[PDB]
Amino acid sequence: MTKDMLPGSYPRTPEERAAAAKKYNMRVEDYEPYPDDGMGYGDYPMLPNRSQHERDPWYQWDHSELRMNWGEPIHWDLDMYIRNRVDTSPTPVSWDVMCKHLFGFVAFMVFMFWVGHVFPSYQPVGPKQYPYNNLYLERGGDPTKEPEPVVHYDI
Amino acid sequence: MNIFTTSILLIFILLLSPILISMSNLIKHINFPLYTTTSIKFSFIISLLPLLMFFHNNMEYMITTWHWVTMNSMELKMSFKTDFFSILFTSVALFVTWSIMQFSSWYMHSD
Amino acid sequence: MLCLGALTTLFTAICALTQNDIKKIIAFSTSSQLGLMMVTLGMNQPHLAFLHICTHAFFKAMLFMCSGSIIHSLADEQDIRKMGNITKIMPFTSSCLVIGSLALTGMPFLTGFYSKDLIIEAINTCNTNAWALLITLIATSMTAMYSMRIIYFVTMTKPRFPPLISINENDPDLMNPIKRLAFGSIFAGFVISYNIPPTSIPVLTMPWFLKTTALIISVLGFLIALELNNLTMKLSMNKANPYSSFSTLLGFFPSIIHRITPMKSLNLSLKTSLTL
Amino acid sequence: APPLTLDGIKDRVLYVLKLYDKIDPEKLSVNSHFMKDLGLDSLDQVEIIMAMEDEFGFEIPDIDAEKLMCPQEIVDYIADKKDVYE
Amino acid sequence: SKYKPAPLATLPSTLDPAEYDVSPETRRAQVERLSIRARLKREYLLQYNDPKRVSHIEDPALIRWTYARSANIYPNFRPTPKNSLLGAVAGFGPLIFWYYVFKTDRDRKERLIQEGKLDRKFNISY
Amino acid sequence: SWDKDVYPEPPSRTPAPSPQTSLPNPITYLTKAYDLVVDWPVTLVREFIERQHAKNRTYYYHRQYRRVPDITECKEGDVLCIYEAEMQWRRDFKVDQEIMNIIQERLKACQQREGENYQQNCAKELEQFTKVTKAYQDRYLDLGAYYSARKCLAKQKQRMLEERKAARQE
Amino acid sequence: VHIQPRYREFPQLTRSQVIQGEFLSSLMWFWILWRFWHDSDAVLGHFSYPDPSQWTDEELGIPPD
Amino acid sequence: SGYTPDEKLRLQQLRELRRRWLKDQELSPREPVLPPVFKAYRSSLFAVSHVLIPMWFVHYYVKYHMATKPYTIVSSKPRIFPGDTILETGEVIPPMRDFPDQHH
Amino acid sequence: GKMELPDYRQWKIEGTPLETVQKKLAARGLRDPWARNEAWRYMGGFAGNITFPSVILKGFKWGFAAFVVALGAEYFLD
Amino acid sequence: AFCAPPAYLTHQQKVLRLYKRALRHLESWCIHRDKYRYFACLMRARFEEHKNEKDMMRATQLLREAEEEFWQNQHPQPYIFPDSPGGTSFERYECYKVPEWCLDYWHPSEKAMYPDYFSKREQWKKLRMESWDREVKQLQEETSPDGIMTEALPPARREGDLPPLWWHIVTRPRERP
Amino acid sequence: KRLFVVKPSLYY
Amino acid sequence: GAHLTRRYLWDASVEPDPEKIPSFPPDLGFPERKERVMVATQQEMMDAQLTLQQRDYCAHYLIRLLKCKRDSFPNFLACKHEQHDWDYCEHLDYVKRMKEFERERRLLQRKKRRALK
Ligand SMILES: CCCCCCCCCCCCO[C@@H]1O[C@H](CO)[C@@H](O[C@H]2O[C@H](CO)[C@@H](O)[C@H](O)[C@H]2O)[C@H](O)[C@H]1O
Ligand SMILES: *C(=O)CCCCCCCCCCCCC
């Protein structure tokens, strides 16, 4: 495989744009290099950011899993857009409407949990009571040292 | 403590014979789905004897089978805490898996 | 654990109320009962949380087997919208499918009553988070609402499956394993509850409404479900609302978290680390 | 379920069409065109394919639905999709 | 009502204003794209169905992609103020952040061992 | 067998069975049948082996390691005497790892058997652990990966000085 | 058994599944009834929950202001 | 609106080859050409070579390798009640104190 | 074992909830041309209305019948 | 799946496709068949209504309006056939679809167990080779002098000729291996 | 009818 | 219940903050209170293996209940009277603890009154 069949540097002239498009099997009016900020793209095509979930599922794609065709130009971020990963397909609910609803619910539940911490539910019952000095010895208190008499009455 | 220990340890050996068989030539001659289902069934039934002994005595165990390695002052041993939870869960789990194993022979009959 | 668990039981029950795949409804049932075991541990009730695991294994396993029987007999169809009238064409499975639902929804003296009932008795009579208590009781009624969803659409309406009928359930490798669970779904909790050692002191003393609280909400959940699911027979069109969209789309947590989070991380993996 | 055979498909395709009202059974053969010999419009043939998908339990993609214009074509599209060869 | 798009929730094809364009200039774009598509599809098939093939079908589009993303990045990289700041921050940004987390933590730890205010009660492995 | 002084073990106190129900204990039956069908045949196989091990009785001994001059008795640089002081310390340091494990076995063995009374009836074993741990930490903690006798000595001298300076004020 | 497939008509049900299904439903219903007879208290209650106002200051030992 | 005549003619030809392909997949009567009790002797050799024989090895290991090492098998101390007779020393646990007695 | 489809003039929507659809649609000039393709669902062996009580109260008959027998046995055995 | 898509959908195709989508979603909301039949006839009323409006500049404006109405009344979870894209059985058996060429590596001792399948297979490999040359030739003869091309393919115009590029369609693995 | 099952060469 | 309504909403001083009960001296309002009596001794609870939570004042009944469940084995249903006894004694203890909320509430309501005077 030769140098002119491989990606190159950013196309400065329209004569090197139509050369680049023909390399990548695109229409000249469709070829669009990445912006020349010198981040290393060269002249590789900038293709629309659609994940492969959006490709026609019923078509018999040549690369069946990737939903591509042989020869077609591959998006720069293909491995981020394969069907196992990021999905950009349209949702029934707008992106921001989901975002406003999800965190409103999570935020509301967080608030209501604190409310329930300052107004706890309990029963009108005084504390449990245990014998032998609150079971001082059985909790591992020191046998030699004498606990403080804690006592409970019949009522 | 030998019969309790032996039955506890014996459950693992029963479930490991389907794994061993699967790695020999025998698996191509027998009805391996039925062999596993029978194997797990006997495992469940043995799992009741440790279960009953706990219902009688409520007495838990700590069985160290193997010494694996010492990292200076910190030994790592294969050891089982056959207490209340693992005694009862072991039986419930082996009972459900006896159903699912036999269910699979019907559900996956084409696979 | 008390607040993390309580949130799980409500959130997944809300999700389960409007799903259509049979397994996702059952899978969402598990998430909610798992959250309730978590709520139990926040009461310092470890032995109840475990007794629920042991009880919940029986009927929940059966529900998947009874549901998995339908799926096989309908050419691997799982949408309950294409199931109907199963209490007649598949008697055995439907019978076990209704034992499983009632064991799950805490009906007295089934496997799931000797666990769920005590937990609902405990959640009321302990010092706790008021909101965790409140939503955990609501989620206990929704357990009847979404179980009724399966009983209704799967067993009770009219047929909606394709017209070539080849439903067979006479295989012993199907009936026998389901029966074992069916006995477990009925008697197992009783035997377990009476043989284990006494663990903790149950608060057995409470007003009459905290002692039947579980039953009433479960009954109420069924009653509310009947009315709601019987408006679908009316010749009036159903419309979207934000509350059902939230239920149907899992609160949008997957649709956001599984899109934004992997994008930013995988975008950093390439633009920053590898390239820059 | 039982295997699909070419005659069993053919019998179920016509059976579904004979319960359609806008079709008149007495003049309904396998070669009947849906737009010429029966006088059905586009918006009906869409509902006809929808009725086939329900009958057989699988979808026909739209790129293929819009060309199934006679009972034989439907029968042959189902037969080729489900590896039915006699 | 109305649907507001985003990068992770694109616009449905049926809601795209530019998808109901029918002016002749677009229709000719859409017909050359198919012709380019069909020309390649024809060439792939003339290899896939070939009986004398004995190896796989090499993919120039995939060779270009992998080469564009490795052997061709550096030649097409030009330093700029935005790159240099980005690399400087990306490079030493996290490294300085962690230095103070660990250094601050271990200074609080070394401080508390000189004054004995630590509970290393049962700790005998490190 | 094992030495019951290295591994102390309270005697078992099993209550004598008090069966007041008419029914038969199914534990006590499978225990008889287990003894006849499992225990009895196995004990014959073992008695057969130990009669072979009696015919070929062989002996092995615990190796004695006399004491060599300490590190403190080594002139700086004399690698001949440092080497032996270093080998001895490494032997000593290793025996101390195993002493710690033994003290840990007891504490673990007590925690299990006391069960619900470990907070009270496991005090003595928790006290030896708490004491033998402080000694271990005073000998070997913070030495590092390249621990040796000379670092052990340097750590001790730095501690004997920090305590002498306690009374030099008090 | 090897049932026969049926088109658009309700299929025949083997006796085994009709009775195997029927037994289990009745086994459930019997067990609920049997339990709810002997052990009704566990659902309804067994102990009375005392009212906290009928109690008199004598037992609670309040000292009259 | 549907198949064009050339379209429909291609399907006839492929469909002809296709069905002649799937027919070829059918196995002849003689293929594949391999190269060569309800609770008894079938159910004895299982419960006697997967339960009994494995129990001899597991018992041998427990009895002479695990129970002969210190602390390998450690059990909870059994419950002892006020009234029990201890099978070892013969001691008798004194009876409890006295209950005022109650009835619900 | 060959298929034998039912006679296709069997499927008639009279006396089924599909009638009420033709009543409702025919009150505004429309008509359902696929009603007879839905009909087999609402007639024959699939007729009726399964009510929730009938599903829950299944085997209650014989469960209650066994209960009194079992309950009676304890009385006599006492 | 079998038919390659056109360059662009016509207005007629974009309205039929919507019609089918809108019915399938209706059936998702209604569930009950009687209720689904009632509203499906109302739906057809809304498509028969403007059936003849042949303005061709308001027909479009009647479609974009109707798609924007569909996108708001979507079912958030429509019914899908188990084998369709997005279906639960979709691609379930793709792990059992071994290509026919994998038999060309079979050991002879493996091929010795199916002597008659492996004999009806060398015929097919012969038929494939003899036909290939004439297939390639026919595809050039129909290469239209103008580059305008479509993914479709020509049939066999002669006798004793298989349609060009027929092996990957005829031999494809069974849908349910 | 029994159909042939295409498999990879498992002999190796 | 009422108490939660009362403690929130209406007054908030005449309601026992449940985590500080008792609050007033034990002997106030009582001529002499008899210290509560423990039937079971430490050796007996410690030898029947009672979890610390179980060593409440009703332990003597639970010691009998366990004694039954071991001796009636395998008959796991043959200890219902023993369970009822332990369940009853716990109920009484619970009622005892219900009398502390009332007493403290009533007393704490007294202090509000006399304090106004
Ligand atoms: C101690 C444990 C014992 C528990 C009780 C065991 C009871 C055993 C029940 C056996 C059931 C016999 O099943 C028999 O079959 C018929 C089928 O027509 C069942 O069903 C029949 O009657 C029921 C009653 O409502 C109708 O709903 C149904 O449409 C009809 O088919 C009946 O229930 C019974 O007549
Ligand atoms: C006061 O007792 C606080 C306890 C917590 C309130 C829980 C409410 C439970 C609802 C049950 C329905 C009762 C039917 C009359």
PDB file of N, CA and C in Angstrom, chain C residues 26-60:
ATOM      1  N   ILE C  26     -40.068  -9.576  36.464  1.00  0.00           N
ATOM      2  CA  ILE C  26     -39.609 -10.463  37.524  1.00  0.00           C
ATOM      3  C   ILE C  26     -38.231 -10.035  38.010  1.00  0.00           C
ATOM      4  N   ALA C  27     -37.353  -9.643  37.090  1.00  0.00           N
ATOM      5  CA  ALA C  27     -36.046  -9.146  37.495  1.00  0.00           C
ATOM      6  C   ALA C  27     -36.177  -7.888  38.337  1.00  0.00           C
ATOM      7  N   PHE C  28     -37.110  -7.004  37.981  1.00  0.00           N
ATOM      8  CA  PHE C  28     -37.322  -5.804  38.780  1.00  0.00           C
ATOM      9  C   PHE C  28     -37.977  -6.124  40.107  1.00  0.00           C
ATOM     10  N   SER C  29     -38.721  -7.226  40.176  1.00  0.00           N
ATOM     11  CA  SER C  29     -39.225  -7.696  41.458  1.00  0.00           C
ATOM     12  C   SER C  29     -38.082  -8.042  42.391  1.00  0.00           C
ATOM     13  N   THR C  30     -37.046  -8.694  41.871  1.00  0.00           N
ATOM     14  CA  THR C  30     -35.916  -9.061  42.714  1.00  0.00           C
ATOM     15  C   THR C  30     -35.220  -7.832  43.270  1.00  0.00           C
ATOM     16  N   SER C  31     -34.966  -6.832  42.430  1.00  0.00           N
ATOM     17  CA  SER C  31     -34.280  -5.640  42.911  1.00  0.00           C
ATOM     18  C   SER C  31     -35.017  -5.040  44.089  1.00  0.00           C
ATOM     19  N   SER C  32     -36.350  -5.076  44.047  1.00  0.00           N
ATOM     20  CA  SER C  32     -37.148  -4.468  45.099  1.00  0.00           C
ATOM     21  C   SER C  32     -37.110  -5.294  46.375  1.00  0.00           C
ATOM     22  N   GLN C  33     -37.197  -6.618  46.256  1.00  0.00           N
ATOM     23  CA  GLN C  33     -37.079  -7.464  47.435  1.00  0.00           C
ATOM     24  C   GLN C  33     -35.661  -7.461  47.974  1.00  0.00           C
ATOM     25  N   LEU C  34     -34.666  -7.319  47.099  1.00  0.00           N
ATOM     26  CA  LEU C  34     -33.296  -7.156  47.567  1.00  0.00           C
ATOM     27  C   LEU C  34     -33.157  -5.885  48.387  1.00  0.00           C
ATOM     28  N   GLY C  35     -33.768  -4.794  47.929  1.00  0.00           N
ATOM     29  CA  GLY C  35     -33.711  -3.557  48.687  1.00  0.00           C
ATOM     30  C   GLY C  35     -34.360  -3.687  50.049  1.00  0.00           C
ATOM     31  N   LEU C  36     -35.431  -4.475  50.133  1.00  0.00           N
ATOM     32  CA  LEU C  36     -36.115  -4.681  51.403  1.00  0.00           C
ATOM     33  C   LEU C  36     -35.246  -5.462  52.382  1.00  0.00           C
ATOM     34  N   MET C  37     -34.523  -6.476  51.901  1.00  0.00           N
ATOM     35  CA  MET C  37     -33.541  -7.140  52.753  1.00  0.00           C
ATOM     36  C   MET C  37     -32.516  -6.140  53.254  1.00  0.00           C
ATOM     37  N   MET C  38     -32.157  -5.176  52.413  1.00  0.00           N
ATOM     38  CA  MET C  38     -31.228  -4.136  52.820  1.00  0.00           C
ATOM     39  C   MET C  38     -31.835  -3.243  53.887  1.00  0.00           C
ATOM     40  N   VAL C  39     -33.109  -2.885  53.727  1.00  0.00           N
ATOM     41  CA  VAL C  39     -33.802  -2.109  54.747  1.00  0.00           C
ATOM     42  C   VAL C  39     -33.811  -2.863  56.062  1.00  0.00           C
ATOM     43  N   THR C  40     -33.957  -4.183  55.993  1.00  0.00           N
ATOM     44  CA  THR C  40     -33.954  -4.994  57.200  1.00  0.00           C
ATOM     45  C   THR C  40     -32.644  -4.853  57.950  1.00  0.00           C
ATOM     46  N   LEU C  41     -31.521  -4.906  57.233  1.00  0.00           N
ATOM     47  CA  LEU C  41     -30.218  -4.829  57.880  1.00  0.00           C
ATOM     48  C   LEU C  41     -30.015  -3.498  58.580  1.00  0.00           C
ATOM     49  N   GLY C  42     -30.660  -2.440  58.094  1.00  0.00           N
ATOM     50  CA  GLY C  42     -30.636  -1.162  58.774  1.00  0.00           C
ATOM     51  C   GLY C  42     -31.441  -1.124  60.051  1.00  0.00           C
ATOM     52  N   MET C  43     -32.296  -2.112  60.281  1.00  0.00           N
ATOM     53  CA  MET C  43     -32.959  -2.278  61.563  1.00  0.00           C
ATOM     54  C   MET C  43     -32.115  -3.063  62.548  1.00  0.00           C
ATOM     55  N   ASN C  44     -30.929  -3.495  62.144  1.00  0.00           N
ATOM     56  CA  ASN C  44     -30.125  -4.404  62.947  1.00  0.00           C
ATOM     57  C   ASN C  44     -30.825  -5.752  63.062  1.00  0.00           C
ATOM     58  N   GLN C  45     -31.508  -6.139  61.999  1.00  0.00           N
ATOM     59  CA  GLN C  45     -32.246  -7.389  61.943  1.00  0.00           C
ATOM     60  C   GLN C  45     -31.540  -8.360  61.005  1.00  0.00           C
ATOM     61  N   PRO C  46     -30.293  -8.740  61.287  1.00  0.00           N
ATOM     62  CA  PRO C  46     -29.570  -9.598  60.337  1.00  0.00           C
ATOM     63  C   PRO C  46     -30.226 -10.940  60.090  1.00  0.00           C
ATOM     64  N   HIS C  47     -30.800 -11.561  61.115  1.00  0.00           N
ATOM     65  CA  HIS C  47     -31.363 -12.892  60.943  1.00  0.00           C
ATOM     66  C   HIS C  47     -32.687 -12.877  60.204  1.00  0.00           C
ATOM     67  N   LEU C  48     -33.398 -11.749  60.196  1.00  0.00           N
ATOM     68  CA  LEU C  48     -34.563 -11.626  59.330  1.00  0.00           C
ATOM     69  C   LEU C  48     -34.146 -11.424  57.887  1.00  0.00           C
ATOM     70  N   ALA C  49     -33.118 -10.608  57.660  1.00  0.00           N
ATOM     71  CA  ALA C  49     -32.646 -10.383  56.303  1.00  0.00           C
ATOM     72  C   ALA C  49     -32.186 -11.683  55.673  1.00  0.00           C
ATOM     73  N   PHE C  50     -31.606 -12.575  56.474  1.00  0.00           N
ATOM     74  CA  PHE C  50     -31.185 -13.860  55.942  1.00  0.00           C
ATOM     75  C   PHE C  50     -32.367 -14.789  55.726  1.00  0.00           C
ATOM     76  N   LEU C  51     -33.297 -14.830  56.675  1.00  0.00           N
ATOM     77  CA  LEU C  51     -34.455 -15.696  56.509  1.00  0.00           C
ATOM     78  C   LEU C  51     -35.258 -15.308  55.278  1.00  0.00           C
ATOM     79  N   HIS C  52     -35.230 -14.033  54.902  1.00  0.00           N
ATOM     80  CA  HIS C  52     -35.882 -13.612  53.668  1.00  0.00           C
ATOM     81  C   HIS C  52     -35.163 -14.169  52.444  1.00  0.00           C
ATOM     82  N   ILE C  53     -33.831 -14.143  52.440  1.00  0.00           N
ATOM     83  CA  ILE C  53     -33.085 -14.736  51.333  1.00  0.00           C
ATOM     84  C   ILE C  53     -33.480 -16.189  51.160  1.00  0.00           C
ATOM     85  N   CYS C  54     -33.485 -16.936  52.257  1.00  0.00           N
ATOM     86  CA  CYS C  54     -33.810 -18.349  52.175  1.00  0.00           C
ATOM     87  C   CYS C  54     -35.241 -18.557  51.701  1.00  0.00           C
ATOM     88  N   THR C  55     -36.169 -17.714  52.147  1.00  0.00           N
ATOM     89  CA  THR C  55     -37.548 -17.859  51.690  1.00  0.00           C
ATOM     90  C   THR C  55     -37.701 -17.377  50.258  1.00  0.00           C
ATOM     91  N   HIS C  56     -37.071 -16.261  49.921  1.00  0.00           N
ATOM     92  CA  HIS C  56     -37.279 -15.657  48.613  1.00  0.00           C
ATOM     93  C   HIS C  56     -36.707 -16.507  47.486  1.00  0.00           C
ATOM     94  N   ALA C  57     -35.744 -17.378  47.781  1.00  0.00           N
ATOM     95  CA  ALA C  57     -35.173 -18.224  46.740  1.00  0.00           C
ATOM     96  C   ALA C  57     -36.207 -19.165  46.149  1.00  0.00           C
ATOM     97  N   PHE C  58     -37.161 -19.620  46.953  1.00  0.00           N
ATOM     98  CA  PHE C  58     -38.110 -20.626  46.500  1.00  0.00           C
ATOM     99  C   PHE C  58     -39.041 -20.060  45.446  1.00  0.00           C
ATOM    100  N   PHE C  59     -39.933 -19.150  45.827  1.00  0.00           N
ATOM    101  CA  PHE C  59     -40.964 -18.748  44.879  1.00  0.00           C
ATOM    102  C   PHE C  59     -40.381 -17.951  43.720  1.00  0.00           C
ATOM    103  N   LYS C  60     -39.363 -17.133  43.972  1.00  0.00           N
ATOM    104  CA  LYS C  60     -38.786 -16.354  42.883  1.00  0.00           C
ATOM    105  C   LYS C  60     -38.181 -17.256  41.821  1.00  0.00           C
TER     106      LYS C  60
END
